[PDB]
């Protein structure tokens, strides 16, 4: 047979990311003395649009502790920040939108975003627009914290893991019908070559497992085992249930 | 490609020791509306530039020509 | 009451001197033939003396501490009036409208101002007025 279309994204030739207009990797600040023993203040210089992403970025400019200069970094902008805002970062900072605190330093029921999985990864969870995690509880001994991931999963992380207060800007984005194949063309030119999607039904027995036949139909179950093997996997993969919800 | 206005400043460049040659151009024009007159230009050649003086009143232009330095080798018209 | 007066220190916020400190010497509150606005004659220091330290001896101290003054008519709107003060009675005669108009009288009138300021920087009265504002 042939090598199918999803097996063909691994070698990553024309499928790589379209990286040109991107302002940079949006991260939080390296974890250092000043931030874990106290706070350090920047100001947000301009909040700007990043290509390929859905949410704006902010550029806050800190002062390097050990050398005379400025250093400016790329934060995914929480909703409500504004240029000219002081952004405080560190253990002793205060609870306000945009300030990055450790999670142990905030009461339960606090709404933070761009939170870290492990301390010093410079952010992981809830970076898409409109997302947030809630802090639902603490474990002050063998220090952990109980947070609610934007999907609704409940994860338990370290209490030295930082996160920035508030909701990520760009909420409401998918409320608007996209309305034409052109606007979906301008969406994925800045992301990657995924589009448009030929139904595996509509291709030949070589192109796909769903291909062939004098009618268009799958012919065998569209749910595939998690223990399937490379290229067998197309369709709903290792689903526990299927079909419209009620 | 420059112009001089004061007569005196022109007398300087002629001695400025970079000037080997000069010239005198005569142009017949007219002024105001009605009547003509005889206009002359003095073009001294620097190394990097060419200076000119314009004399529209011929009562001055003659007293100037005699005043040129003797070393300067002048090509008239 | 009127806090713009003969001793009142100010900051120069408009032009070539912006950021430098002055002292309001002869204010005209309202009116003049030229300057149809409230203005104040001032004196200030254009160069600030450099950091002097324990380690500098001999001639460096005299050449670090050199002051360069100025005298200027200025509009109130271009001044920040502040709470500080100077004892100005030294040069009250030497900084005047008559000093302007005859610009020779202006470089004659910087000397009596330059001398009064490098005095005070010895005997550290008015420590602040001699320290560079920074911005």
């Amino acid at each position: 047979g042939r090598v199918i279309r999803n097996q063909r994204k691994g070698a990553g030739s024309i499928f790589t990311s379209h990286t040109r207009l991107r302002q940079g990797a949006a991260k939080l600040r390296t974890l250092d003395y000043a931030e874990r023993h106290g706070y350090i203040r920047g100001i947000v210089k301009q909040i700007v649009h990043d290509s390929g992403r859905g949410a704006p970025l902010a550029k806050v400019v800190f002062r390097d502790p050990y050398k005379y200069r400025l250093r400016e970094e790329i934060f995914i902008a929480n909703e409500g920040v504004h240029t000219g805002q002081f952004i405080y970062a560190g253990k002793k900072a205060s609870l306000n939108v945009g300030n990055v605190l450790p999670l142990g330093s905030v009461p339960e029921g606090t709404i933070v975003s761009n939170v870290e999985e492990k301390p010093g990864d410079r952010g992981a969870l809830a970076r898409a627009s409109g997302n947030y995690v809630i802090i639902i509880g603490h474990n002050p001994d063998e220090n952990k914290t109980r947070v609610r991931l934007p999907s609704g999963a409940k994860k338990v992380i370290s209490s030295d893991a930082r996160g920035v207060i508030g909701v990520i800007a760009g909420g409401g984005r998918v409320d608007k019908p996209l309305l034409k194949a052109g606007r979906a063309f301008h969406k994925y030119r800045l992301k990657r070559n995924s589009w448009p999607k030929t139904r595996g039904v509509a291709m030949n027995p070589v192109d796909h497992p769903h291909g062939g036949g004098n009618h268009q139909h799958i012919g065998k179950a569209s749910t595939i085992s998690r223990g399937a093997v490379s290229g067998q996997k197309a369709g709903l993969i290792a689903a526990r249930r299927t079909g419209l919800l009620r | 490609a420059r112009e001089i206005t004061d007569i005196k400043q022109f007398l300087e460049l002629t001695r400025r020791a970079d000037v080997k040659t000069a010239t005198v151009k005569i142009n017949k024009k007219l002024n105001k509306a009605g009547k003509p007159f005889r206009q002359t230009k003095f073009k001294v050649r620097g190394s990097s530039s060419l200076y000119t003086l314009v004399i529209n009143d011929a009562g001055k232009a003659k007293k100037l020509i005699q005043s040129l330095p003797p070393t300067l080798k002048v090509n008239r018209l | 009451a009127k806090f713009l007066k003969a001793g009142k220190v100010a900051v120069v916020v408009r032009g070539r001197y912006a950021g430098k400190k002055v002292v309001i010497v002869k204010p005209h509150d309202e009116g003049s033939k030229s300057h149809p606005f409230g203005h104040a004659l001032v004196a200030g220091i254009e160069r600030y003396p450099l950091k002097v330290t324990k380690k500098h001896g001999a001639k460096k101290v005299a050449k670090r501490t050199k002051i360069k003054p100025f005298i200027k008519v200025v509009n109130y709107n271009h001044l920040l009036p502040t709470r500080y003060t100077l004892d100005v009675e030294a040069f009250k005669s030497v900084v005047s409208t008559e000093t302007f108009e005859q610009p020779s009288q202006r470089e004659e009138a910087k000397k009596v101002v330059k001398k009064a300021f490098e005095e005070r920087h010895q005997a550290g009265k008015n420590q602040w007025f001699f320290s560079k504002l920074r911005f």
Partner: protein, 91 residues
Amino acid sequence: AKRTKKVGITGKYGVRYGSSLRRQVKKLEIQQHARYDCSFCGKKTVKRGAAGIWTCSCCKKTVAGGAYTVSTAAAATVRSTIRRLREMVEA
């Protein structure tokens, strides 16, 4: 002169796309092209430059916000929840 009746701003789309989708966009595109008060300068200059970013042309503040509107729904209850937890610990 109101011109059109129902379609309003979506008259640009003509007859295409189906009535619901055209009506559901008319909901948002009246929000993103609308002009809002400015929480700083006290005028209404605020307009959208892009998804997420809202620019004052008066006080030149830029303000992050919702994609199709200034203040998202679930946001205005975060800055109250954050205002409440702040006072909880300091009171």
